[model samples]
Target chain A: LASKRTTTVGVILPTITSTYFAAITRGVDDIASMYKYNMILANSDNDVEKEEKVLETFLSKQVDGIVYMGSSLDEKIRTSLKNSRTPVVLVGTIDGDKEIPSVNIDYHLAAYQSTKKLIDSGNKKIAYIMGSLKDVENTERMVGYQEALLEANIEFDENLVFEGNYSYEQGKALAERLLERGATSAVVSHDTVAVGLLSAMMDKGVKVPEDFEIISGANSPITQYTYPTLTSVNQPLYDLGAVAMRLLTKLMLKEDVEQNQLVLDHEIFSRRSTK
Target chain B: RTTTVGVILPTITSTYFAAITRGVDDIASMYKYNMILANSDNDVEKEEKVLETFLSKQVDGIVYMGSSLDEKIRTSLKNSRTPVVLVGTIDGDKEIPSVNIDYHLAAYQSTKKLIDSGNKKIAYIMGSLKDVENTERMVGYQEALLEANIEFDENLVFEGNYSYEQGKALAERLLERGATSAVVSHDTVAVGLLSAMMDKGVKVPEDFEIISGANSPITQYTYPTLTSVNQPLYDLGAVAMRLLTKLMLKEDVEQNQLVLDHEIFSRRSTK
Candidate 1:
């Protein structure tokens, strides 16, 4: 095993253009450097086919370990990971079957807390802006949103739910429809979407927090750059990546085993976007 | 050669550098080259250590990006046997090839645009003035002011790390200096200034205009979308990688220093 080790870890991210993934990569890189391991970084662009190709390349390179971050893991990729001899760890994402070791915050609880914050502020018509419902994370978030609505005695309206590809343009385009649907607030799953919605709303003579309120899901650095500074769920992005890499290092070295499915903590970072 | 290219970036947290990495990856894949990425944390020592590690790995090539190159790193790069290309940065001595936009011309045009819009006291904001790129921008800024018959005041020029908070804090100082417009060199900084001004009830493009240097995606996310210089960020990385591939393969090369075209993307932030 020692002779086979290349001391290189392969890291694949869904997209590097995001502040969320960038921070995670920073964490992973720092930890890898401390362990005297080099990293091969690949961008999958959130495409499953591209991810598979990158995975094949990593395996062919004979890296010592793999750290993967993606919105959703395809079955083909999961099987590939299962078959590969190299140790694998997931960061900022999860494996549905618990067959893969992973690190993540409780998405369900985050969604519940964020939605409940809007409800406590007297908002009944709150929208849930998110990525595809096909994604497990989004599904978990929706379940949490529905639980919050149930607890508040407000009827859950499927019409208030919007799915997008997490682009600023998509958020900008949804602003008008949100107003038409009488949404007084929103729980945006991504910071870019939240910023876009806020910008478009303010542009169209709508007052943020007065006419519309927002709670961005991921409290990335961009959350601070927006006017009125977005209120957000503070995902421990860096810790998630750092912890996942540490766990991978242990697995690669055949160290004492512990719980593989690690769940970190999260909190709401209040700013001007909330009343 | 290890069939690997080591990429050293000041930081990957910036969208500007991240997009460039994407371009490098796509082209490297096409040429069957793997990439080893290292974050320098913008520290000179860390950059030197990363370069040493890459050299130990015997990488076939290197693509380096940072705000400025130190003398020690320059000597290492100059003496290294591996082919290297500088992306979105410059080699002051013209010894190492680089891919970038004409920073001096970009600054000149940005300043001239603000001046043509009837602004006399336009603030120029950027990172370290010691950086080769920023120095080039400074010369262009002075040239534009000279052509417009406006004396450059040191008070209207601000140097800061490319950060959003720094940009926010500089807003009051800008207003105090009676600057009605600015040519900001970082997108996040421009957004910060815009957000701070608006929070304080200052209207953009009407009361205070801004032109950001890099037209990253964040430029569009601002309330009054930022008008920015569209640096061909991805192409800079792609062309740099293409050049590295040629140098590594001993192929005939026509030009070492490549300057891609640039244009100012006018948006709501500009009048």
Candidate 2:
């Protein structure tokens, strides 16, 4: 069928495997589908170099706009696009050198909400189980954690927090750090890391929210499988993506599309992982 | 507004990536972004040329779904006007944006699954460890063993190169030297291992329970589905596009890391 745009919005992100992005995908897909627009999906797995190459391919294809979700990327490629007639938008956070339009959640606020939830549940010794602290996005959780600790008059204890690159295997290894120190309640940097923590904790016969409580950064489906389930932060991912598609349209139109920073909303989900 | 999205994927023949493609279509159909498809067997030069071709043709946006990316090829992408999106691996720059889940998790989860199944004898098919994703997989495998109180045997870890032939060869070697259950290689090798073991007269699940990594449709569709971690390749691809939508619209998104969830997807493979 001929789409209304007679064009497709070529979309790209780190990877779609995670449900977090899947949830937000509708934001764009819903509108695109309604308008008979088609979507092109890419899986970067957070590789900057691979993502750049993909951009080149898209350019050759002569796509209209771009919705990017990766961090730092090729400066020159983006710079060249600066003079191009086409338009681009950054989905998550600010890219390295590109001042392209962007939309993202207030990570600091989300992180604050996570720790605040832990405090509301009447836990003081909150441990942070984080993923890939080296990454620009993952560290935001850490900063948020500190922000909440300071708000609650709690000292940020490095001893109580564990970090990794967001892998269940590494999450398991880092679990030992929390166990060795004996932490009570915690907010993880990401859900997959939390999954690993639960795996390790259960393996050791540690009861969740009983012996210790846990809350995931991005509440995901895996939260359902845990014995008591998990508590997490809900976001308007689907809406966000849909909105990104619109901005790309504006850029394509070269209509004085405004703003580089766009922020979405977040919510707290109460589950067995936390009070 | 409708969009004609052109997707350059790795190989949709695989179940996970296909699932992502399906999701993309599902969402695109809903949002009206026309979907176009391409496959680049993970070659950089081909990928670059492919994007150039896409740009020349006028797709509203471009989604590049591939793992391996070369720097020189990426540099060429900077010259294009259309926005380039990357999936499967991280290579974000000015011209191209990205969506992803942690590659480390894909590996680590597989290893942990093997450990959870009460299999102590684990061997890794260390294929292309030099690659970013595989290296993370190795870390996950090693960490899982460490948690299981099993001997972290590097010697037992054979570099199978993620090939079906190598998988068969590795299985034969493991059986001859006396190895127990394993978190085997990726889908292609994992399937081959099962075939070789069965051909050599090894009863599956009884002789040994296999928990593979990067489970593909082949494993799921198999007669006796092989136990493996559904890396959410389909989810990975679909989510990547969704994120792109958000960026394009210039709406607010929470956090930079838009990690989609993972499902153990227990079928006959593990049970």
Candidate 3:
């Protein structure tokens, strides 16, 4: 029995509640079933300590491969991942180097295009609301936001930017900051944040897109059902999961992966939230 | 390493399904067993194909979630000794290891709430009539109507495949039927129904009362918020996996079937 192959892959996700990871998991599940490989999926809840512990457990269990759906990795985590040699594949966003295989969308372009859509509508004080800057994805998105601002000849004011923890409550808090800074518009990185920011805007008796325009960073079913449908950036989230697992299987079998870092495409969805 | 559990669910989109999968994943990870998941999309043929694949792959166990235990699937489960467990569903009078809540009573209570609020003609929007869960809900609705001395008219029950679009369409049907209140079985469908109501400029609670089952976190985000039956979905899934684990290990389980409790979470949707 000990000589038998486990044929198992470890899938580490931030959480299952987010529609983003949930959709990705469907693709991973589809591929895993097709290949007859088992996936030991775990939720880290975005805790760095818990994430490290989960990886440790997977490594000790001797899983055949690992698929990660987080933004970046710290030095210690990266070193541990390197040492384990478990044929890890990163999904959603790549951290830094191309040494590890990754499946991700060009979030920079998605953010740039989404922000430019708002800018083109004659909005100058566009606030960029995001999750933790620790995430490399957010960093890339921030770069896109800044680039769009520079191209529009609008000075990027530091006071117009705020961070939220991808929660509606955090979005509400960021809305307060946006209002305090007299910002006329905002682009959010999470749907819950967009909803919360919208909630706060309504509380202040401001009509969305008339007095304040807001757009979600990611599109989900909730975006369409809101008071005013939210405009958002749609990345190939499912492809990220599907492609990452396919790459991991290749790496485990010592097959050549055509690309070390696979960057997928994204589209901006214009809706009532944006003028 | 080859030992794994095959989990068949309707889809991976909803919060209810996600929570259940999380429960199963936690237990499987604890026991060092791997899980191979699949979505049948509620098609029996596709489900059979997935089951055949699992058997060929030699999965140690399977956790099935579906509506109406078809004969073909029942025979496969009965014949295969590969340790099968049903989550949020059951086979017709078959003694299969399964985990669920008291759907009948939960539905009865939710319906009685609508009755108490002076809604005599309460419409029941169901996901699938073939599903035992929906049947139990219908039975409970019947019981409440009977208790209130109201006629249990079969015409009040409308069948749907549990999609949000269907919910919206059924909403119009309910209004056309002159139904004053409703109790829907799915959250997404309830959202769609709510959307249609909003589209027609109908005020909730004041103009119409509605309740839905399967409460998740997102239920709070809906415009008027949804009143839902808070079934212990996580526990239902966890207990099912635990039962399966015991059966897999050949341990003596006192109960072949376990039914957990369900509660009603009252919110703004219902007056």
Candidate 4:
């Protein structure tokens, strides 16, 4: 049976340029190496079609298992993954039906805490900067954002919700619009975007935390390097990947996994960006 | 044919390595080659094991990136018939083909800029001096100092682990030594020093100057952004993977030791 197995896992990431995903990859690699398994990496470029092709190629190569991380999982890919005989694990993502096993942090709660922190700091007109609303993760984050606003008796304005691809440029471009909307604070969904907004605001002569406060989603390494280091939700990014791989190993080895959906804890790391 | 190319990196946690990896993956996919990526953790034993796994898998080629190449790995690579290419690293013996920017020239230019800006006491902060790339950089630093008629101070040279904390800790020592500027070999380290100096009320490019080695994305995120050596990191990986493909296909390679272009990208960190 060992001879028939490839002892390899195919890892699909939306993008490699992200420090968040890179940290996750490191976690996965360390565990995979410990278990004597090699990883074949593929970049989906956040494209569903490319993701499907990469999955097909990996299956054709007879990889023992799969670990997928992406912005969104399309219906067709979901069906292909569900039909595949190989064990599959999702990291930092979710499958609505729970048909696929996954490891993730409580994104909804994390978003709520970030928004609540801004509200507690006496800031009204808070903006929610996120990736595409079509993404399940972003939708979850938006719901959390709305819930926090409702609790504080602050009405949620659709105009205050901004969506864009996760890029520093996108975050920078939104600064003008954010200022135009008179938002005093924001809960950004990505670190680069938060940094971009921070930098652009500073460039336009606005003071951070004094004039505007920001709380980024991921407490990535870059958060510490900024001028007024960002306050962020510390997602257990590495653990998310490590636990997912461990779960995948259990699936491939036919070991009993009590729960297929694993939720990790998250904390808000306060830094200079928050008063 | 396996049609798989194995890539070994010291670590992918850094943006420097991650961007290079993106380049390798892009080209490998274009060539219809699956990439098997392994993290060496900069450990020699782990690197050896990774190479063995790649060999056992019968991968068509390997693209290796590390801080340094040891004698055992070099010997093992030489013995293996599979095509191998080095990326963002060097083979001291020049036996294994590699793709990289000229570290010596880049370092020279970086040091020269600080010297031209009237810095009499310039520090050279970098990774292990034992690494060939750092050694090349040291030589360039010395040459620029010689050209400027400034005495080379051994006390000013520091060896770092390329971490932000190390840079932060070194700031006090740098200030104590009365050094006006530094050429740091790591971006995170440069930012750490910049942030630490700012914390101490010293203004960048006015009271102090820093030039980071790799112009990774982190260089731009800092306040008064860092001036850095644009190493063309992505292209370095792209060309290395491209060269490995040629070697794997048994194509006639005119030159094996390829050096890409590099430039000193001036930002707010430098005057």
Candidate 5:
């Protein structure tokens, strides 16, 4: 009476509202077909409860494999993954904290480099905006930002950091707060958030790269078309998706794999938003 | 061997297309058909290569969501018996099977809304004239103007690529042409156009009114927001895939073609 499939894999992603997840899914879609396998995709909406429920559905349905793109699958979900006996690969780094096979770019170091770039340009009062603390990726990004500050003998001020949901609507208030705090530069977590920041800056008649410098983590397509453009880190999400699927295939085939945890490269693309 | 369905998209980044993909995926997953998705990146050469690859793969069926199509693509699609279907694209005279909204009416009604709001000398920012959808939209816009007894001035139309850059650039021309209101065909372009207007101290619904063709999540994020023509993107995709499924199964279908409705979502950009 149970459900089933052999050439099909189940994929659960955060949300397609951002191009980051969309690009990753495309990667998963392309490579999955190359392996002659099909995919069933689910949008998790970045909810832990929804992700867990989706996990139950996939496990019970008996999909051949699952690629999970959420943060650390909760304890219940983590236990479920180990017991399900299906090859499951996490998309981003839940590094060291989990023992699951995963594919990710070093988001920590990327944030560090971006933050350091602002400092190197002689901006000390740099504010940071990122996603909720519930996400481990944001935790890593915060640490990376802190690390850059530490390296420069600059003390970290909790007041200089703003954490919220990654959306432009939420970004407006954060940008206003950053400016109110006298932040001359900021490292934002998403391109949309940066767009919001730019919008708020415009409302105040402020200029980018002149009065305020900004950078974003997610190098989305519109980053180039944005007014004053945007400086961002180029992380190949497609590669992360492709490599994750490739790893999932290895696990499915029971092949002798050399590395389970794979880290990809990231580069900073300087644009008009930065000096 | 598993039955595979090929899906080609213009680009993966746009939320408009992403919503469409979600619809297609919902149906594909239900029927247990594997979907192979390809990104054209809006390049004709790359699109041709992708199309040829799909043909060689001998996929069970194909669903395409894109604007411009060249002769090479049209000829290949016409010759293929693989149950090819176009989604959200209108080929005026082409007899190919398609699932789309009434592009001509959608554009006509949207522009008519702007005209009814008591604005004259309205500028139309158009995308590429290559796609039949754009051509149909242009025809509809012209029809609305003609019916309103306004002499159509060719100078009021500006050629645009549907990019934010083009939207901003053409918006400058639209403003320079002394248009009181404007209609844009793309969302990002509209956003860019609004940004340009904001930069020059021009306010929407005050100095000039604007309407955008595509409705997306990004539309809600802009300051003062934007007015847009909302297309049933998910329905368009799901219906297209469902029709393709029927064609592939060789079942007696209700209709070989389907046309859905369009809506004008009034916001701060419009009065």
Candidate 6:
């Protein structure tokens, strides 16, 4: 189902991640080459307002269907696309008002499983290092974390959650705070945040896994090369990109489809993060 | 009848860019093909408006420079039937015929030169390193270190901050860190480095040697003139348009990748 392609698909990504986005574009390009469908690519730097404007522009351009990495297409943009007859598919959940054709897995479930793994290993004090969880994805991840705490009867300590701005320096600052709070087990919100948190902890002479274990949000290539290889959740990012292209084509063909769909299976990669 | 080629650059701010524009115009005038220009002001939205202007103006072939589109630029170009060529960027697996010198090779060669000149420790005078040119330059720096068997250290790299004052302060910071010689990035930044070194009683080409990537006329007149990597930007731009002209006329395009070589000029700064 993921491999199938039909019509031209226009992609609207919020921001571009150099190698990752390149690989994703390449995947879509290969599919476009074989399926004889042109792939239209654009970026918004993850701004919802720009996302709306670009959607309008693409609609004016007469793009058949759209594939986007958006943060909750607010009701305004959602209605706009719905009315235009150009189906919009998202890499993550198409949140707000109604559902559109999208391909995403359970972020909440994966976060819960990752948290439970740390708790079940006889670890009591765990710190969560995440990017500005104020965003949609982070909020989704936080929901899963809260669910895990309630299930384990571990009092949810707000102090244990460190908020960073998806950067290495933020990770370091968050790690310092988390360590100050005496967190022996940690769940790093994202790979970017985790990379910094891991280094910061190492800087303070804290042995990983033996004293503190970390679980990153996704298994990105950058994490694999880390000193103690990062243990993270493996999401089908390239496949997710390719699938978004396929979904856009399906909509262009005027085919019947489910409103929201998940194209991926999330699994935890066991690495040096867990001793 | 000879057809025309449209060359729209973002905006030329300095003489370095003036030379490039001159080169494009020189070759175009020589070849007898007319050139059309639209200063898009490095704005994406303005570029869209300018595209409409170009379409209404009926330009044959287009050579676009220094503008990153927010939406549907290349896709729109594909549909317009006017052949489009891009300079200084390779994004979304762009198929537009491009001609430019390799930023990575030039940076690496300079770094290698510094290492070969017995400068064991090297400090970077940075530009917008996040940009493609700087990114390639950084990669070149790493490659040079690996070849010379020097460990890569992020602390050794410093951003010139694109200001002479920042370059001067940056030189002070690097000198404080025990750097003997510096690659002070572009010429303006090199000027800052020279001024800072001079202020601190450090002699150029004696106490330290500085290398500049690219500089303008002021480079030669400075107390310790800058040595820079001379780019064939205008030549590349003109040649790319000429290639597009072939595409416009339904003629065979010669080379897919027309790479120009970089020249490392020497002066008192690098003596």
Top candidate, metric TM-score: 1
lDDT of 1: 0.88
Candidate with the greatest lDDT versus the true structure: 1
The lDDT per prediction is 0.88, 0.65, 0.80, 0.87, 0.79, 0.68
DockQ of the candidate models in sequence: 0.64, 0.05, 0.36, 0.68, 0.32, 0.04
Model 6 pairs whose backbones collide: B126-B160
Q: Give the lowest summed-lDDT range of ten residues in model 2 chain B.
A: B216-225
Off by over 4 Å in 6: A1-8, A18-25, A131-140, B1-271
Question: What RMSD does each model have against the real structure?
Answer: 1.9, 16.7, 3.2, 2.0, 5.3, 15.1
Model 5 lDDT tens row, A183-261: 9999987777887787677566787788899888868665654555678888888888998998888888878678887
Residues A1-275, candidate 3: write the lDDT tens digits. 46678488888888776677878887887787687776677888777898899989899889988888764676777888989988888887576766778888787887898789889999989998877676778888899999999999999887777864677788766767787788989888878788878867765677778889988876764565565456788767777788877888888888987777888887888876778
Considering summed lDDT, which 10 consecutive residues are worst modelled in model 3 chain B? B216-225
Worst 10 residues of 5 chain B by lDDT: B216-225
Top candidate on DockQ is: 4
What is the Å distance of residue A76 in model 2 from its true position?
6.0
DockQ-derived CAPRI band for the predicted complex in model 1: medium
- Give the better candidate number (1 or 6) by lDDT: 1
List residue ranges in candidate 2 displaced over 4 A. A1-5, A71-85, A96-98, A131-140, A159-164, B1-271
Q: Interface RMSD for each candidate model?
A: 1.6, 10.5, 2.6, 1.3, 3.6, 16.8
Q: Residue by residue across A94-118, what tens digits does model 2's lDDT show?
A: 5644366777777778888888887
Report the error of model 6 at residue B63, Å. 10
Candidate 1's displacement at residue B99, Å, is 1.0
The order by descending DockQ is: 4, 1, 3, 5, 2, 6
DockQ of 2: 0.05
Pairs clashing within candidate 5: none
